[model samples]
Target: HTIFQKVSVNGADQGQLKGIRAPANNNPVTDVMSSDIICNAVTMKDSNVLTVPAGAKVGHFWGHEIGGAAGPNDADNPIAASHKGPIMVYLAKVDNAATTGTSGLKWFKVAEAGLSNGKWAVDDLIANNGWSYFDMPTCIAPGQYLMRAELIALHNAGSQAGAQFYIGCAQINVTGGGSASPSNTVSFPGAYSASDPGILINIYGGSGKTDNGGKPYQIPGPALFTC
Candidate 1:
């Protein structure tokens, strides 16, 4: 939502256009060859994460402030909707089910709050049983914050206890830093998978998300992940 204002600087009256208004590089440009022309650039502000909790039914609230360069852009425009801005938030989870060969491990938004009292409704952010793990993309912001995951059921999917569900949390900082520090990552490496069921858990890792230049930048707040 960056606004580039232009005014006439020439002897002509105000709001007069002398040159053709166009985009300068990627940013919008106005053609004002008049002597009275003035231009201005302003960025927009957005909201951040609100409330979050974990359980059979969870409650999460997200706040968003719109304005400035945060709006969705057109296709011809390089700054499309995909290009993110300063604002960011986190995604929560509620299970430690094995990443492979398991079903019924679902995640959804709480649509109805009052019906469930304080707990989140299954239809909040997403529809009933409309949860998908791969779609849970992490935010670009990188920082250290509290991470929690309320274990709801022992084995709601299939095999009860002793199923060995390796549940863990990882940091997703996209600041272009080569190192994934300030936040730890979760992954079942091939080497580790061959061994017996022994899960590795760490709250912090070296180097946060990497930036385009391979440098690390801190987010305004910590990138939280809960379930």
Candidate 2:
């Protein structure tokens, strides 16, 4: 996946977030969650909070999120879908004392789209201008949150340590939500392990590898948070 430039609530643009860095390979750990990169937004601080309503169909625009394109093929190409792995979205409540980083925060798996028959299940997500849509759980409480989008490329995962990760985070304020709380939350670095069955697998046919059983790919992470 590529870096997100802007986010869309319902169907309207919510503007760009400044100082955000480009997308990077997050095999071991990501700097945004480790508090290493401080790409905080000051000018768009207030305007950048994407106002997502409960049950709203939310999606993001690639190339910039709210700015210009990173390159010719940056957001236009479906690199993540081409890999035929899982595309996931997680949300963490941001505390008032929290900086623009994910350290000391707890995240919950809200939604995910994975593989089917060795093909990405969410193909339309990337095919239609790199936009992926998911519903904000109606039971989530209203709050400020960091929404993380990740793609795990497992084409070479037969080696156990060959999987690659690409991730992005967006600041959002959820409103018009209910009071139900999500459980079974998890942390990023702690959520995945090299030995996880879903992470350490051979997608292509091989001696010890059987083809996917015509079911959704078993993505590694917390179970989907249901209301």
Candidate 3:
């Protein structure tokens, strides 16, 4: 596996986050409750209704929650607690080259207000632009929801070899009724330990490893959080 190069959201470097940073290998994404990442407008399927509640409050959550075993840290985070209206969360994976297959990936919606067996499950909220939707159900009891964005690259022939990208998720709230917020954002803290850190003390130099070409790859920098 190649080292995933760091990217920026709004020009912020990896690990630096105002709301939430997509889980990177080293800096793990962390956040508190009632946090949210606000976006102007989100696009879902043409049929899917993506809008804010006429007068409801709104907020979002990302990365590992308070209590959990911990999930895969990737370039994406989950958003929840939408009372605005029906909105769509989207993320883009760089490529589709998994262990195999052209399209074995899928997204799942985890929990909601009106279910006991609530957990991550596959559901269709929209379908367009080579992406699928986890479709969050509106009109349910207003509260917090634990949703996740996943990319499953099933093994298959003709699969491309590169970074596989997928759409993350967006949270919409209907503030007119039930408890909700106008708009908010949240993210986890810390970096993925396996990634990199600056300056080395060993003779090997901060360069801890080599690439496939035997080229030295130096440790990048320390974990960072912006917002």
Candidate 4:
């Protein structure tokens, strides 16, 4: 179990997000049909919205229920060692990011990371000292929006709904941005299917989470939205 506790812009820590909820005592959300799939919790609060400029590097720092690693050698700082899979970032433009509801709003993928160079995206998070990052799109409309950071662990995903999804949503205001309207929008609960190959797979054996042709592991969900 873990939580996205802090945010940073351009490598500068911005302290903890003003609003981030831990689902059911910091446990991962498994039911994709639930609204919890939107923000990792049923209710997301209005908080101090971060002011981020377009093209900025946004970093999300994850840790245990409370905070991060005990030390440098703490292998499992944010999550367990066996938890392996991808990390994804999505953005939903809204009238007021902090006060907007989690449902019904359209979300577009911003970034993602799957198995690369023989390592899982979680390992990259660990390597970055628990901060998973993505660049704020320089071509998106300027205004308030919610940033959704989702982490999936498919190690024990040998059956439907067997994967673990630990997620968090942050409120931000994008400044000096473009007007590229994002498309191929998706709803959190409505976007994912439990039977999706990426959502249910065994990494240790069987068919395994392997590549096809030049493609890497199939990351479930829609294609990324960029400008």
Candidate 5:
């Protein structure tokens, strides 16, 4: 339902044209147990690595589809506002991000936007002109890493495995001084469960759906890592 378009660093008008590990098409991965939940692409493609300074903020821009809107106010730059849910960014240091396999990589959350003022994180991207930004932790160890930017659409999450997970990974080579390691780590396909409250819920209308209810959305996944 959306497209991973570009990655813009702080104060940069132009986004990087490389290093983003993208899916084959604009589709949501509903099964939390599937291997595709790792990066939304079972067989990932290769691209050049994007190098950035530590503590720099990055905006992961998403579109409705290819050749849609190039910028804001075109009426189709961001995700659908009705796709209400959280936006999460995770970082996993790898041996070589540009050539590493996606399976079994350790990750820690860096940034997340959940329910705020009755608006979901997906709404913020719509408000910010389709930019979902995340801060690169300044205290983490400097290395090649994969920055996973994910958006969870909860409009149809009333049933088991009904939630839609849209994800993209931006390979980056972090440059800074840091030795801290992430301890609260979790892997894909095991981090989420169909029965989890965040994965199966009701955000609209009446709670007519089974195994879930209409309530304030809860941001799923592990706690974030900080400096």
Candidate 6:
């Protein structure tokens, strides 16, 4: 698992916060998921969340997808090309802060990628230039939001709480969006549980393989929101 070092919007560079190493406990916050870090901004103050048009394509740039190698680029060791799991994106409406402890902001899944060609690896997502892209729903109301991107590696997830999650959040302001509100939103720590079938399966042990040998990895989270 790796931390997010940079991000982009519609092909334009939207600087990122300092990369924080993942904790040994694999906790979301207290490791690298904190909102105390500020992003490089032009239109808005660095203290505020970056702003983007509604329905825009948001890209998350990581130092490396997988591979034990650290930093924005990889050398020799590369886990991404071999790492197998699912990538998910979630969006939450925030009033004025991007902190994770903020109450009242509900998160909803917007996009996800699962097994492709019997496997899901960094190579499969490299086509987008190492950036996992997600489209913001155009029907959502205009407001401040926190966009979270997560990659769950189930390569060794044969036991409970074995799945490793790499998560990061970006602050953004949605403009030109509709007035329709999203539903079925859930919180972060509350959304996922160690006992969830999707998060506790083993990808390499054939537990996720179908009778025909086709692998169907279950991605956790609520139904994808539609505009």
Q: Which candidate is the best by lDDT?
A: 4
lDDT of each: 0.20, 0.61, 0.22, 0.79, 0.77, 0.60
> Per-residue lDDT tens digits of candidate 6, residues 64-168?
533234434443112355456777877777775444433445888888988766657455555554567778788888977777677776665667666666666
Better of 4 and 5 by lDDT: 4
Off by over 4 Å in 2: 17-47, 62-76, 97-100, 206-216
Residue 50 C-alpha lDDT in model 4? 86
Tell me, by TM-score, which candidate is best: 4
- Cα miss at 44, model 2 (Å)? 12
Off by over 4 Å in 5: 13-17, 42-44, 67-76, 205-215
TM-score of each: 0.16, 0.76, 0.22, 0.90, 0.89, 0.76
lDDT of 5 by residue, 1-227 (tens): 77675787785633533677777677898888887887777344566778777888877878776444345544554776678788898888899988888788888888999776666787788888878887787888888998888899888887888899988888888888489898779887688888888888876655442222335666788888988
| Model 6 accuracy (lDDT, Cα) | 0.60
Instruction: Give the per-residue lDDT digits (tens) of candidate 1, residues 168-201.
Output: 1221112221222224332212111212221111
Off by over 4 Å in 6: 18-46, 65-79, 98-100, 127-129, 205-213
Global local distance difference test of model 5: 0.77
Residue 126 CA displacement from its true place in model 4, Å: 1.1
Candidate 4: regions farther than 4 A off: 19-24, 42-46, 68-73, 206-215
Candidate 6 weakest lDDT stretch, 10 residues? 36-45
Q: Give the alpha carbon lDDT tens digit for every residue of 1-227 in model 3.
A: 01111222222232312222233322211111112111111222111112333322222322322213224443222211110111223221112111111122222222221111221111111111112223222333242222223221111101222111121333222223343222322231111122222111121213431111232323222211111
Give every collision pair in model 2: 5-64, 5-65, 5-66, 6-65, 6-66
What lDDT score is found at residue 60 in candidate 1?
19
Worst 10 residues of 2 by lDDT: 36-45
